[PDB]
Amino acid sequence: NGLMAKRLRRELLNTYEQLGKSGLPFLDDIGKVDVKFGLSLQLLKSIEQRGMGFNSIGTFKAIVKLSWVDTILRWDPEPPFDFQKIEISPDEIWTPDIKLFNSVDLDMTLDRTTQAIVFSNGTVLWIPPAVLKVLCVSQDDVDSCHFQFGSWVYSVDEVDIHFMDDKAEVLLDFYQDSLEILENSAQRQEVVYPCCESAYVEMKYLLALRS
Amino acid sequence: NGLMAKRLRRELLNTYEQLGKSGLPFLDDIGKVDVKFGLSLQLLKSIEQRGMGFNSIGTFKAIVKLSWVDTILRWDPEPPFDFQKIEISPDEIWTPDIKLFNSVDLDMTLDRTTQAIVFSNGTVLWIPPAVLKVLCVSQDDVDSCHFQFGSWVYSVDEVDIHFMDDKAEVLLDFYQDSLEILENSAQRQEVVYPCCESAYVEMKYLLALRS
Amino acid sequence: NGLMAKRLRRELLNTYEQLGKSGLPFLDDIGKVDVKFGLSLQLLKSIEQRGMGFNSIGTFKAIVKLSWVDTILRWDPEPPFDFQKIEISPDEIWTPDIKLFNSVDLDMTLDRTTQAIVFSNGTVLWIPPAVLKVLCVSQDDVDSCHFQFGSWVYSVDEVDIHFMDDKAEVLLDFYQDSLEILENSAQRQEVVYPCCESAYVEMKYLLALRS
Amino acid sequence: NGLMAKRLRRELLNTYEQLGKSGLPFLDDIGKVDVKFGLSLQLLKSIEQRGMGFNSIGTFKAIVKLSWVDTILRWDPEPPFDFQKIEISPDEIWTPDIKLFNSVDLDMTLDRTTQAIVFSNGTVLWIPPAVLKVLCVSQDDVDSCHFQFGSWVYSVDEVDIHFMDDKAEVLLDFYQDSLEILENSAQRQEVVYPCCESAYVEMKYLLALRS
Amino acid sequence: NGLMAKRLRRELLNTYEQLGKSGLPFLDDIGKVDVKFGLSLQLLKSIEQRGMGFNSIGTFKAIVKLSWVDTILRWDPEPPFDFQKIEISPDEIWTPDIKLFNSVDLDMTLDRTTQAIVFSNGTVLWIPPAVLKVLCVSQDDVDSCHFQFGSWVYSVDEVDIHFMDDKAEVLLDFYQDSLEILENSAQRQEVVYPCCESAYVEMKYLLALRS
């Protein structure tokens, strides 16, 4: 039923509307969120040399694939709110504060008009299109670019990240370009800071393209 | 009478103000939304070579024509609400999440200040101007460009798309440029992905222009 | 008295706050809106060749002058509401949905922080600065540009447009540039479309400039 | 006391929250606002030739200094509200609709996150940073640029403007550039328009720089 | 407990919600806010010569680190509010109006989507990424740039600023560029203004890079 589906959304989102979206998505014991992160390359927009040196600015279009469990967005799918999945705006719920650290701008831009899909068991899946602008090295007909992602404020004991389907590389399921990928690897690291306290989880991708 | 027109709109939008705009537009049994889609080209803004390769970024001006039925927005066209149609802002109703997938930016931009028209039988007509920026091949005095459109999170079970007026082509009813058109064809496909389960309707246009 | 003037505005705008700003500005019998339209050129920002052909993109600074009657905004100018006119934001009332159809971008941009003035008889005068970007033909040291304006959704029986002061030309009352104007003509047309039924009013300007 | 300072602000702003920010800032008899206006040049971002002619677009960074009396924002500075001044957001109060008339863009951009200061007598001081883009004449190694400011809708009987400290010149208290200034002049004018009936006050600046 | 954390946030923010974010963060006796400021360079986006002179515009990506005590955001960390710290959006609490004075645009842009952390003793820590655009001198293969920061409206008796960790220099804990740093120093100044009354705290950084 269509009414129940909307009443169900209002039901789940009501917590977030009354207490806000800030803070880890647990009402009971505060646990650890495990984010599944995937990066699917679509195309290169431009590679522009910085000055007359061997660095350059690479602008890419990609799809950022995110998944996590939100304890607050749970229901039992039995009459009449008997659905396995529901569509929700990412601006109406908690979302990981995942940033592109080495962004040449403030951050990557994600299309937040892109809806997320919430399952009965609380598993959120959010797959926004994305624009990424980073500093590359352009030397000997090769453009090598790094991409660095992680939660800004949450440590490993609060937000953790692992590669989707444990593939430590740029995914090519959405690839639509003609460029030759010379190199494609990634890495999960736990990094400590002179500014802060604990370890933080960062996914570091390395991409190299034939120029 | 202008009061009744406004009262009508308010009473129709009551449901959306209470339950939100997310989710398929049905209150009773949840069906399948069928969107009629039309791409009307107006003009080329620019075509810029990417680096010194054979690809380029094409930036276009177009009119995107969309129609579908919204069961929630139905009335009895008899006094004092004898109106055939009513004008609505698309930010007050559900709209299909149709994106330009091969967008070199986050997505195409639609002018969402453009008003939609809704008839008494729940048929919605929305015709927003649009800006489209896609990757083209520029070779042999011809520029070939592709436009890929589809609902982002909805499968063919939920949102289906068909060419408006069975015309599988870029429409030229708003054409205002001086460029020579060499190829113009489109295709409705059903696509599966490794991220997802079911089939997704994508509309793929091919446009080639004399450089 | 300043309070009363503020309270008048509140009483006038109460209808729009409660009923919405969509729909023609009549609360009794629904009539036709007659819009007076004036385009006053201020200056040329740039004219840039598109590729290596005869076409170019011209970006203009202008003042768009608009006047219409809003029945909802009328009042009897007797104490304590003895004001001949009042200033209001155009985001708080109905405004005609007039677009620059042949814009190379989504549309022209009007400055909507610019206040409108409303007279006690309901006449609205709104004169927002505007940026317009169109395709031009640059050939033989002459740049020829067109501007095409119209209500997007309302036909001639709903929203009519006429040149302000019956001057079928780009107005030069705000002109402050050094360019030599070589041609300056305009025409009001009633245009029929494929997608739609009735006739739509379009104001079409031709402006030629010494390159 | 910190608490009382916030209560006072809430109490002062209550009038604008109920009645709105539109309209001259008087609750008793409507008088004349006399805006004190200063333009303080910081630096030149760029001067770029338009086409191959003698005009160019000058983009400047400046501080716009504004001051006026808002009789609605007055209080008596004795306990528990014994403050000589209070900080307020300019988007919470009436501000003069002062535009850069000869902007090449829609208008100058003022930074409206910048707080204003109100003294207990109702005098408002607001000093936002600003970006200004205008037509210049670039000839004989001199760049001559004009700046024209005024209230868009209010005549001299409603909003007057005078040079801050009666300095008819671009002010150099914030000047941080290395450019040679060759002429720095200004004039306050009462201008009569055809669209309108009374006189409007315009501040006109001439600034010439060594190219 | 997760719910208890959200309720704590709602309790802390109620003051700001009922009373507003404007004004120094004290509910009792108004005192001085002492801000710790750190500037961490990440990379150079670009440096573009202005005209054909010895100046240029440098565009930098950095991390701005701010810390200060907000007396309003204090709680006793005993059950059931036994949390040492909580994340809060910076648009929900007072933040110092610290500006990049010598910005070539309106201001530096800070990523305000970035959450701040508040500890139970009222200490706020906020570390937004930032883009900074300033005037530089490009001479003898050296690009020398200045950065000037301070509170816009608050004097030394209201908002003070000191170098975070007493490091009077640009910090390199986030530095991801390949550029050679020639000069790196900074200085806390107390500056009296002619437009105004008291003394203002400004942080002035000097950075020279190899071209």
Ligand SMILES: *[C@@H]1O[C@H](CO)[C@@H](O[C@@H]2O[C@H](CO)[C@@H](O)[C@H](O)[C@H]2NC(C)=O)[C@H](O)[C@H]1NC(C)=O
């Ligand atoms: C308020 O609480 C904060 C958070 O603990 C204190 O910040 C600490 O500062 C000390 C001195 O440098 C550091 O050694 C600690 O590591 C900091 N704490 C953390 C967890 O980051 C701050 O000092 C406290 N202020 C007081 C004492 O009132």
Ligand SMILES: *[C@@H]1O[C@H](CO)[C@@H](O[C@@H]2O[C@H](CO)[C@@H](O)[C@H](O)[C@H]2NC(C)=O)[C@H](O)[C@H]1NC(C)=O
């Ligand atoms: C409202 O109060 C303010 C503050 O007292 C007055 O502004 C000051 O005026 C004195 C004397 O003219 C000057 O020396 C100061 O420079 C002013 N302070 C600032 C920073 O503006 C103001 O004149 C009063 N307004 C009126 C209309 O009397």
Ligand SMILES: OCC[C@H]1C[C@@H]1c1cncc(OC[C@@H]2CCN2)c1
């Ligand atoms: O340790 C006390 C507070 C801790 C949570 C702090 C924080 C706030 N903002 C940014 C932070 O950066 C952590 C690393 C750097 C990028 N992730 C930490």
Ligand SMILES: OCC[C@H]1C[C@@H]1c1cncc(OC[C@@H]2CCN2)c1
């Ligand atoms: O497979 C189960 C969930 C299904 C709804 C999912 C989804 C969420 N976000 C984006 C999606 O993309 C679908 C196709 C690929 C691009 N459109 C799917």
Ligand SMILES: OCC[C@H]1C[C@@H]1c1cncc(OC[C@@H]2CCN2)c1
């Ligand atoms: O008769 C069917 C509805 C009619 C009102 C429709 C409509 C909606 N959006 C845009 C429209 O365009 C009309 C002309 C072309 C641009 N103005 C029409």
Ligand SMILES: OCC[C@H]1C[C@@H]1c1cncc(OC[C@@H]2CCN2)c1
């Ligand atoms: O004649 C009475 C109306 C008067 C207030 C009108 C108005 C509205 N919008 C813009 C206006 O321009 C006035 C001059 C030109 C720019 N300042 C006037």
Ligand SMILES: OCC[C@H]1C[C@@H]1c1cncc(OC[C@@H]2CCN2)c1
């Ligand atoms: O002196 C009385 C008022 C004082 C608070 C004023 C103010 C308002 N806006 C900006 C200001 O600038 C102060 C210096 C210049 C940059 N910081 C001051």
Ligand SMILES: *[C@@H]1O[C@H](CO)[C@@H](O)[C@H](O)[C@H]1NC(C)=O
């Ligand atoms: C929740 O549902 C999704 C898809 O239905 C499934 O992949 C996921 O494992 C489920 N969560 C659990 C652990 O039951």
Ligand SMILES: *[C@@H]1O[C@H](CO)[C@@H](O)[C@H](O)[C@H]1NC(C)=O
């Ligand atoms: C609803 O109305 C429009 C125009 O009145 C028409 O084109 C459409 O087919 C109608 N739908 C049905 C099923 O009657």
Ligand SMILES: *[C@@H]1O[C@H](CO)[C@@H](O)[C@H](O)[C@H]1NC(C)=O
């Ligand atoms: C309404 O009043 C104004 C001010 O006198 C006048 O100029 C305008 O023409 C009037 N409108 C009509 C439609 O008569």
